Homo-oligomer: 256 residues x 2
Amino acid sequence: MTDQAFVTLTTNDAYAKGALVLGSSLKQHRTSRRLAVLTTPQVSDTMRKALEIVFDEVITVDILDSGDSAHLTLMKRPELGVTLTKLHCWSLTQYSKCVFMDADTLVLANIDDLFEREELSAAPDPGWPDCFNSGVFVYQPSVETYNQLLHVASEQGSFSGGDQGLLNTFFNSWATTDIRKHLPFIYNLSSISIFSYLPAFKAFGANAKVVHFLGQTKPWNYTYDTKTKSVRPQFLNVWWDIFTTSVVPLLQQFGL
Amino acid sequence: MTDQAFVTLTTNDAYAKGALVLGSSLKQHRTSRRLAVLTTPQVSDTMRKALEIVFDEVITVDILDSGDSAHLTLMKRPELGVTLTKLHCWSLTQYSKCVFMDADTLVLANIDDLFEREELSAAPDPGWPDCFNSGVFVYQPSVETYNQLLHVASEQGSFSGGDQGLLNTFFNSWATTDIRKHLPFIYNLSSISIFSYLPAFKAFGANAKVVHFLGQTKPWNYTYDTKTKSVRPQFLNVWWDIFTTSVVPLLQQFGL
Ligand SMILES: [Cl-]
């Protein structure tokens, strides 16, 4: 649909790499949706221009600017920079529904069916499964929800010191209400649960639709051998394949 | 209710300690339900007699006996000893509904409301949260279900090499169907998620109703200082308090 989007976020050039890989993965699996990326001014012109090619829309967010609605809350809780920036995904009222995906996710199959879901649909978090992981979620842009999230951020902050605590606190019926708001874990498959919980992977992890690179060493903190097509494991190598294949050439293209 | 029960299982004297602590924890939080314990002949007379005091019913299961319905399946899949024994929880047709709890769980509050639940209700597993953890679950005893589980055990075994894989495979709609069959994580709170996922604990882990001692070192593999009332952490110490207070005296009582 025209007014639906995957939305991601990048606050720096490291994460812009992820966002570019994510965007590409989404294009590769023939999404019929828009691709939007929240970006900060800290993202350089080269990453930016590549984001402009990969994404239908590049939105600038500067919570460091006092014009930003999140800025006073950033002052109150300065650890919440990334969180308050991320929450701007709710400002995107040019879209009726979006799938937010962190820039450290990777799409391995079309996940457009996520748009059948209602706010707030998200996959369970490993570790504390009565929380949803905020790495992938379905939400409806709204200035009201935005303001309410912003307000909760101000009042409580996040029990996680990040967006996950904040989102779970506001969307707190997730655990106990409407199983359709549980996204299958395969739509936000923790790369940790692929290596750590290895019995459950073998049986279901070949079904993965989205890899969420958690931790730790993010995909781009790895060394990739372009000859062997392998890092210094399966999923890191898909990410790097996309990076090497689609993203680097788009990045090297901006220097002329 | 008269014909409802918590059911646990012990295949040896190490686990009988857990079962005795579990049973006691259940009595301590004034359950109105029956307490049943599947036991193997490998459980010694002393553990047994103490089980007889703590539990309303002590049921003997010997899958090593060829009279047992599970025995031929044990022959086919000998790694499934514990699993096939556990599955006998479904034979307990003297009960209309039961809560099965592994002998490495600990009850910290009345959880009798679990009997409002239908088969198969269970808490999500940490690590792979689209599986339920088989440490605590609500089920309806039935020879049909039993036979069907036994049959699946024979055909597929368990993708986990344990009961969890088997149960998830048979009760495979759990992830996607009926949010009421998701037991809050606090009814099967992984002791690992208490130490490992520490941000989510502080906010919700004080609400714990059942601790599931996973791993690893089981509670009884720890040294307990009875003077300091502490092990060699909060939950280990509740377990040991119950053990020292209620269980050991019941065990020392059998030697005369
Ligand atoms: Cl439901």
